[PDB]
Design brief:
The structure is a homodimer of 692-residue chains. The first copy, chain A, has helices spanning 4-10, 13-23, 33-49, 128-137, 156-165, 177-180, 245-252, 335-353, 375-383, 385-391, 417-425, 439-446, 468-473, 501-508, 513-531, 539-557, 561-566, 572-594, 600-615, 648-654, 663-686, and strands spanning 53-65, 73-77, 83-86, 108-109, 117-118, 120-122, 146-150, 170-174, 202-203, 240-243, 287-291, 295-308, 313-323, 360-367, 392-397, 407-412, 477-484, 634-637, 640-646. The radius of gyration of chain A is 25 Å and the shape is globular. Chain A starts with a helix and ends in a 6-residue tail after the last helix. Chain A is built from 21 helices and 19 strands. In chain A, the strands form five sheets. The first copy, chain A, has a seven-stranded mixed beta sheet, sandwiched between helices. With 692 residues, chain A is α/β, with parallel strands linked by helices. In chain A, 36% of the residues lie in helices and 16% in strands. Chain A has three domains: 1-66 and 293-536, 3-Layer(aba) Sandwich (Aminopeptidase), CATH 3.40.630.10; 67-292, Glucose Oxidase, domain 1 (3-Layer(bba) Sandwich), CATH 3.50.30; 537-692, Transferrin receptor-like, dimerisation domain (Transcription Elongation Factor S-II, Chain A, Up-down Bundle), CATH 1.20.930. The interface between A and B is large, with 52 and 52 residues. The complex binds a molecule of 5 linked components (NAG-NAG-BMA-MAN-MAN) (2 copies), a molecule of 4 linked components (NAG-NAG-BMA-MAN) (2 copies), the ligand O=C(O)CC[C@H](NC(=O)N[C@@H](CCCC(=O)NCc1ccc(F)cc1)C(=O)O)C(=O)O (2 copies), a molecule of 2 linked components (NAG-NAG) (6 copies), 2-acetamido-2-deoxy-beta-D-glucopyranose (4 copies), calcium ion (2 copies) and 2 more. Chains A, B: It is a single-pass type II membrane protein. Chains A, B: Belongs to the peptidase M28 family. M28B subfamily. Chains A, B: Ca(2+) binds at residues 215, 218, 379, 382.
Chain lengths: 692, 692
């Protein structure tokens, strides 16, 4: 028959392997000819696989590239202005790729140009709390200094924002072996660790969901009216550049001034990790000089959009999307994901050629310019927002399929928890020691829920991937899944030249069994979402998490009992709303199970109630100063785009509140955010009441 | 049978008459006990009439009232500070009501307190062009002056905003007989004209759609967090008070300074209409002094919400709403409308008691605090916005049923033009000379379309009534209809104490036949919208008007050919989008007529495409500095809230552009607005394409 088992059985590890190899032989940098050619290949193949239509959707967006004839680098300069040490111009290419052209050298995308010269301050991970420690406790002033920060813990854009607000005149980012060199494993090509010449690329924007910096709100189409650079969204004001740990050792070894405040500031290099400012006595007249000459340029990008029309509800869309652009070869990021999408499309197309169609429409997307700020997905969603918010059932992301070989990692809306539990109980575990056991069993054993015995950990969605527009702007139920390691600082070869097909085939997944498991999870979710008669969402799971999040935010506020008394700060309305949501969801669930199953209008009313429940958490006014983060329950952390924050409006109103000069105003804003949250939870609850 | 004819035949003129009398014996001022009692009566009666549920929805909103022991008035003061002339403390009450208590004296709701003293400047209607003439041509400076303006032409809130920006320190509004005294008709009680002691009440806010000044975006519920007065939306900064023409004559007769610039500045009083500043020689040391002591106060209001659940699509709402609060007796405004709603509810309830239900759910609303800024409807819509934007089919307004006895007046979305033409062809004309002819025929004869022979005039929706939140904020197809006069300056007794039951019964509609015709139009529209299998919207009518509006806005821009050349200002994208909309709408219409009629999912997809088409013109970012005006095609005029403006974003970008100091910036913003409009029209068109 044509059921989920038939779909799942058609997926093959060997096909994923072939596609991965096919997608990783040359670089596919956004805006380059090679990535346009790959888009055309994928379009052709998806048509051959049997999709009903496959189109390219293009946009002209702001991208950033080094200058090929004026390379970026950092120096130590002596008192005469002689450059006595220079950082590398490129990563040593891996074996057999030493003649591959168009490898973009390491750079921080969207850095402005400049040649700032100054004294170094070491700022640990450049987190908000690292800057609090420097200014408030250590009394070190970063104003007019070049700061050097280790990658890790938080999104690099947040590091740069934090350095800017501290008054830094430039930022040097580096990979410390503490964070990117696993003990006991060899450097690439003999293992999966970062060599000392390896460097992590990546953008340093602070877009807060806007998409293309020049066209916030609207697609960057042929007639778009663009902001000037000075009014663009999210661009950094100071130069930034990334280096490897051989080069970092040379910049850090001479550092003087104050000692590190404790061991959480020390990485693994043989240097003191002194904070500065500047170098020790003998070298005190030497300085550090950056040379950044990259340019921002409006450049065409191409999304591939494939459609498999639904047989019964063609006006309901289930979306499987992931990006295609890579920094270099994209062996893990994104092609391990893209190869999985390709095999999922192939399997659905096999069923379609035998006469099957899903109940609802499935859309497949190969996004461009993700690496430059989620630009392809965001512009497309901006173009199609009306269609998406009235018809969008769900979005399943499909970036990297693997970041390790230990167990499953799932982040998603509470509406999908039951779907994920049920699906993983029907899938085979690929893990050694769990032969003949379910994926649910292996996952639950290796990654136990911190709340509930006998359940696996599922995390809330953060950001830094292409679901952002769909979930946090538009309120479409979203999820993601991949294979991960044991225990936000990525795998060692992340965004480096060393992330190749061979990395994956030799060290991560030689049999492609973890890739296949991830294909089954992502594809199985899509199948259920697109074919189940009743949408596979459980509103009661939202009720449970809303109480947890309400308890959490109340607990934060209750660190300030005197102020809560003075300003009459009550969470009673939020708990009331959460109680009401719990009650109404329970009653809706009863009707969903008991409704007349012959009546397709009651079913669709029910299905629309389910689809629009995630939508109900959207506030059209957005969060404060972040108009494109509209979901009231979930936003990316203001301190780390990768991490999700719950009740973000209240959280940010409470953050560091003891430091605000006007407590009356600050606690007034806490109360305002409690009102907005309680109202939104109640309003979402009421969408599940009987309709009339 | 149970069809529209049965519904229409049940409506009775004599019932409307009885309800009107019942609703107009005492004042029903928002926030007063008498208006709460009327709300409870209507709730009880709607339940008895047969609605499924009838609830009160209350909110606590900012209202404004005079101080009963510290009355508002204006003086002429001589050089010693003696008050030699005082304006009236109240309107002479009409016959038989001279002992009625709680008649609110004339005042401008939301005026701040103050006692400003100064020289008068007469500013005609206080329109934007009147202030342009004073400053730019006549070189008269209103800074620190008290301005005196005649009511008429534009919403009084716009007059006050314009006076404030001119630097006025107070505003006196008056009714000139040129605008409020029809030649040949007697003053009330012997005819329908305004007596010299009559005064027009009304609010002077500039809310731009916000609702309650203290809670923009969110309902003013029990736990709402309120702005402080200083941050409230829309409040005037200078005192304002309204007077009648006996009192105005006393203030105007001594005016000196400059002569009126032409005859369009002269009303009908026996005064010169000199502009000032100040009085002529003998009286030059005299001044005008206002005394305003009204207070703003958070006050409970009550909407009545009745539900008639749909038999087939109970999750689709057709709304019939109008306000209940009045300034005094509300003989026309609003009770002529409320009485019509009451009889419509009664007629639907009669059918329901015989076993009928409409296909879709009908909601009936008696709104409160309309007179204080559309507060009741707006707060309710804020509370229920998620339900409304996913389920709202249409909103039919029901304020005053009559403002004259000449012919029909209809303002509505283009989506309802065909519905209105078809319905009025099936209704009998009530007009003398058209016995046995259709309402369509009489209306078309008396109010010909300026574009098309053999069609009647239908206008675009402006604002100043309770449809605003539904149409311009939420994008729900809306309409209104009433009987009107031959040829924005209301009927003479508007918002005066003289607007009584007797006014209506003696002078406007003694047989209640015009009321009955309006009940048939409003009720018939609701019936069709709630019962037609395919929603009765024609998307092709939107295509026709979008071309008209595009031609209009292009024509405005083409008054500046040199600038369009310099800044490369093209409307090509907007015309392209309109062409595309026209083509796609034509194809959708073919499918709507040709689709398989047995398939309820294709029908609902079609019905959802129809319902969401008005929704597609909404921009979640709003218009510039007016976040609650979100419709890109239609907004209230920035110069006159009562008037609708098409392509408002482009219109306001072009307005007075020749006066802007930075033409590059100004024309850049024109181009931005063209892009937003072209994009929105294309996006709306694409919602009518095949869905997959
Ligand atoms: C969780 O869900 C529950 C419902 O089970 C909601 O309960 C409502 O809670 C509010 C309190 O926040 C109640 O509001 C009160 O309404 C009274 C009038 O209620 C009657 O009339 C209304 C219509 O006008 C009907 O809908 C209702 O059924 C009743 O018949 C007011 O008189 C109250 O105001 C008085 O007391 C307050 C507080 O002391 C004073 O501030 C006022 O000045 C005034 O003296 C009050 O407004 C409401 O009745 C409850 N509805 C119910 C039980 O159906 C919760 O609100 C909801 N949680 C959230 C966060 O929404
Ligand atoms: C009204 O509806 C029509 C459709 O009937 C829309 O037409 C589109 O118009 C735009 C122009 O604004 C066209 O854009 C052009 O696309 C070319 C590529 O098209 C092919 O590939 C795409 C996918 O990538 C397919 O969708 C398409 O079917 C074609 O196969 C580009 O090469 C063009 O760019 C080049 O020329 C321009 C202008 O000189 C330069 O600025 C560029 O730098 C570049 O050299 C251009 O982008 C689009 O193809 C049309 N689609 C069609 C016919 O299907 C109208 O846009 C629409 N009106 C509005 C307001 O939306
Ligand atoms: C994940 O899997 C779980 C476990 O299967 C699943 O929960 C189960 O869902 C079914 C179907 O809704 C539940 O069965 C219902 O239970 C009630 C009470 O026993 C019955 O009244 C229902 O009967 C009606 O519907 C039947 C068809 O479903 C008709 O045959 C019948 O005539 C009635 O109309 C029905 O049997 C079952 O109770 C739960 N089990 C739980 C919660 O433990 C869950 O839904 C899955 N999650 C997702 C997202 O799919
Ligand atoms: C206002 O009134 C006008 C005038 O009645 C009305 O326009 C008419 O609508 C009908 C119904 O859509 C149109 O009739 C259709 O015309 C085409 C071509 O002739 C036919 O193919 C259609 O046949 C299909 O549908 C029928 C049922 O409607 C089935 O019986 C049949 O098997 C087919 O499936 C159908 O007859 C008619 O052409 C227009 N007339 C015009 C435009 O002059 C208009 O819709 C009304 N407006 C509103 C808002 O209700
Ligand atoms: O501009 C942006 O917003 C991000 C662009 C780019 N995005 C990424 O590289 N994202 C990777 C980096 C991983 C970061 C992370 O903290 N992931 C957490 C996570 C949790 C559960 C999963 F299933 C998958 C990932 C990713 O999402 O795979 C970047 O950070 O440079
Ligand atoms: O605060 C506000 O936005 C308005 C409150 C109040 N609103 C009204 O009194 N509105 C009346 C005044 C009539 C103004 C007008 O220009 N009406 C035009 C019009 C056109 C077609 C119709 F079917 C009905 C009215 C009404 O809409 O009936 C007011 O102006 O003081
Ligand atoms: C990746 O696979 C594609 C598809 O098999 C290859 O592209 C095809 O190459 C052959 C031989 O040059 C052509 O005849 C076909 O027209 C191509 N088909 C397409 C683009 O759909 C491509 O060569 C492979 N790339 C690598 C690096 O192996
Ligand atoms: C990239 O760097 C090159 C080399 O410095 C820039 O090309 C030079 O530009 C200047 C004027 O801007 C000319 O006078 C030189 O003759 C050019 N040099 C060479 C070797 O061609 C180029 O402008 C930069 N590219 C950018 C900014 O995109
Ligand atoms: C670091 O790189 C710089 C730039 O290439 C080198 O400095 C240049 O050296 C050449 C030849 O000696 C001079 O003609 C240039 O004027 C220098 N340019 C600048 C900007 O200083 C420098 O020698 C390199 N340092 C090391 C240690 O390799
Ligand atoms: C308006 O009509 C209502 C309804 O007929 C009248 O209210 C009723 O009055 C009688 C006699 O006092 C009471 O017994 C009923 O309980 C009332 N019914 C309600 C409120 O539903 C009211 O008297 C009329 N008002 C005027 C001014 O005539
Ligand atoms: C309305 O006006 C009255 C009368 O002027 C105000 O009442 C007076 O208030 C002052 C102090 O604010 C007292 O000292 C007087 O004795 C009061 N006079 C009387 C006659 O009671 C009243 O405050 C005003 N109401 C408002 C602002 O709502
Ligand atoms: C206009 O009204 C004011 C206020 O009532 C009158 O002025 C008051 O007159 C009484 C009695 O003569 C004095 O005790 C008060 O001091 C006056 N108050 C003020 C504020 O001036 C005035 O007489 C009235 N003018 C006319 C022409 O009737
Ligand atoms: C940091 O240094 C600059 C002066 O170079 C100064 O403007 C700023 O206020 C300093 N902050 C301190 C010392 O806290
Ligand atoms: C694969 O799993 C083995 C066994 O647990 C482990 O030793 C190895 O480090 C893993 N490889 C990667 C790349 O994580
Ligand atoms: C209007 O009058 C005031 C001075 O009383 C002044 O501030 C303002 O600039 C004047 N404008 C003119 C004369 O245009
Ligand atoms: C009613 O109609 C008659 C006849 O046209 C007209 O003379 C009279 O002024 C109308 N009454 C009102 C209040 O408009
Ligand atoms: Ca954009
Ligand atoms: Ca509000
Ligand atoms: Cl992912
Ligand atoms: Cl109306
Ligand atoms: Zn990626
Ligand atoms: Zn990446
Ligand atoms: Zn009214
Ligand atoms: Zn009114």
């Amino acid at each position: 028959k044509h059921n989920m088992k038939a779909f799942l059985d058609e997926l093959k590890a060997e096909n994923i392997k072939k596609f991965l190899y096919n997608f990783t032989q040359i670089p596919h940098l956004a805006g380059t000819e090679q990535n346009f050619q790959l888009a055309k290949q994928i379009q052709s193949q998806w048509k051959e696989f049997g999709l009903d239509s496959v189109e390219l959707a293009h946009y002209d967006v702001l991208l950033s590239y080094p200058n090929k004839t004026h390379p970026n680098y950092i120096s130590i300069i002596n008192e005469d202005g002689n450059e006595i040490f220079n950082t590398s111009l490129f990563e040593p290419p891996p074996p057999g790729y030493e003649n591959v052209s168009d490898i973009v050298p390491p750079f921080s995308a969207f850095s402005p140009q400049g040649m700032p010269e100054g004294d170094l301050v070491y700022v640990n991970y450049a987190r908000t709390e690292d800057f609090f420690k420097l200014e408030r406790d250590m009394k070190i002033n970063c104003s007019g200094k070049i700061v050097i920060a280790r990658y890790g813990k938080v999104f690099r854009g947040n590091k740069v924002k934090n350095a800017q607000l501290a008054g830094a005149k430039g930022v040097i980012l580096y990979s410390d072996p503490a964070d990117y060199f696993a003990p006991g494993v060899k450097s690439y090509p003999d293992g999966w660790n970062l060599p000392g010449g390896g460097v992590q690329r990546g953008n340093i924007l602070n877009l807060n969901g806007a998409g293309d910096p020049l066209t916030p709100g609207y697609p960057a189409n042929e007639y778009a009216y663009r902001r000037g650079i000075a009014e663009a969204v999210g661009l950094p004001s100071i130069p930034v550049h990334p280096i490897g740990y051989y080069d970092a050792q040379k910049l850090l070894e001479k550092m003087g001034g104050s000692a590190p405040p404790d061991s959480s500031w020390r990485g693994s290099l043989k240097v003191p990790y002194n904070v500065g400012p500047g170098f020790t006595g003998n070298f005190s007249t030497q300085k550090v000089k950056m040379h950044i000459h990259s340019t921002n340029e409006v450049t065409r990008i191409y999304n591939v959009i494939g459609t498999l029309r639904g047989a019964v509800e063609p006006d309901r869309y289930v979306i499987l999307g992931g990006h295609r652009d890579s920094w270099v070869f994209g062996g893990i990021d994104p092609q391990s994901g893209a190869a999985v999408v390709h095999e999922i499309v192939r399997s659905f197309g096999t069923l379609k050629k035998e006469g099957w169609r899903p109940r609802r429409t499935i859309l497949f997307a190969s996004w461009d310019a993700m690496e430059f700020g989620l630009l392809g997905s965001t512009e497309w969603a901006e173009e199609n927002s009306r269609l998406l918010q009235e018809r969008g059932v769900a979005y399943i992301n499909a970036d990297s399929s693997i970041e390790g070989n230990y167990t499953l990692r799932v982040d998603c809306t509470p509406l999908m928890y039951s779907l994920v539990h049920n699906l993983t109980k029907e899938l085979k575990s690929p893990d050694e020691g769990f032969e003949g056991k379910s994926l649910y069993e292996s996952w639950t054993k290796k990654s136990p829920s911190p709340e509930f015995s006998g359940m696996p950990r599922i995390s809330k969605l953060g950001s830094g991937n292409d679901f952002e527009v769909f979930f946090q702007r538009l309120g479409i139920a979203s999820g993601r899944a991949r294979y991960t390691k044991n225990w936000f600082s990525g795998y060692p070869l992340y965004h480096s030249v060393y992330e190749t097909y061979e990395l994956v085939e030799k060290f991560y997944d030689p049999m492609f069994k973890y890739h296949l498991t991830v294909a089954q999870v992502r594809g199985g979710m899509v199948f259920e979402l697109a074919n189940s008669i009743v949408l596979p969402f459980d509103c009661r799971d939202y009720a449970v998490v809303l109480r947890k999040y309400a308890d959490k935010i109340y607990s934060i506020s209750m660190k300030h009992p005197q102020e809560m008394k003075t300003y009459s700060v009550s969470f009673d309305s939020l708990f009331s709303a959460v109680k009401n949501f719990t009650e109404i969801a329970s009653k809706f669930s009863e009707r969903l199970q008991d409704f007349d199953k012959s009546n397709p209008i009651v079913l669709r009313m029910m299905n629309d109630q389910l689809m629009f429940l995630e939508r109900a958490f959207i506030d059209p006014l957005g969060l404060p100063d972040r108009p494109f983060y509209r979901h009231v329950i979930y936003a990316p952390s203001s301190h780390n785009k990768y991490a999700g924050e719950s009740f973000p409006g209240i959280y940010d109103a409470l953050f560091d509140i003891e430091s605000k000069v006007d407590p009356s105003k600050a606690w007034g804003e806490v109360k305002r955010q409690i009102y907005v949250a309680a109202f939104t939870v109640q309003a979402a609850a009421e969408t599940l009441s009987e309709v009339a």
